[PDB]
């Protein structure tokens, strides 16, 4: 009769769709609360200085 | 010295971070806000702090 292409044909998935995605690449950036010099100045006098 | 008020003059809390996107989420009875910029996650109770 006539020759088809592939994609005239409506394609059945006989596999079974595993998602799996990597875990992105998080980079940690240096957070402190309280820096080491917040803290120094945290003293209400520093005999240092005094 | 220099006189100024009282209440706009000291600050008990300090701004120690400006999150851009702070995903906030319900669960367990609680909201967890997740930072992604510095990778930091804070449990509350679900009631506003007055």
Known sequence: SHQLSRADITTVSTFIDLNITMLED???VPLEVYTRH?????????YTEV | WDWVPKRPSVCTMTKWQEVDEMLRSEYGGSFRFSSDAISTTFTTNLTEYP
């Open chain 1, 38 to 46: 917040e803290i120094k100045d945290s003293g209400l006098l520093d």
């Open chain 1, 26 to 28: 998080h980079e940690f």
